C-alpha cells in the first residue's frame, strides 16, 4: 500500500519489486 516505499512502476508487466502490488496505477505500491 505504500507508494514511496516501493517506488516501482507497473505497466505491460508485473511488479518488479517483490511484495509490491499495482494497486496505484501506474505504479506498484509496497503493501
User: Counting runs of H as helices and runs of E as strands, what totals does the chain give?
Assistant: 1, 2
H/E run at residue 6: helix 3-6
Q: Which three cell numbers stand for residue 23?
A: 494497486
| Distance from the Cα of residue 5 to its chain's centroid | 9
Interatomic CA distance for residues 23 and 10, integer angstroms: 9
For cell 505491460, name the residue: 12
Contact in structure between 21 and 2 (CB atoms under 8 Å): no
| Distance from the Cα of residue 18 to its chain's centroid | 9
Residue 30, Cβ density class (10 Å: 0-12 exposed, 13-18 middle, ≥19 buried):
middle
Amino acid at each position: 500500500g505504500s507508494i514511496p516505499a516501493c517506488g516501482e512502476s507497473c505497466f505491460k508487466g508485473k511488479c518488479y519489486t517483490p511484495g509490491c502490488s499495482c494497486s496505484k496505477y501506474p505504479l506498484c505500491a509496497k503493501n
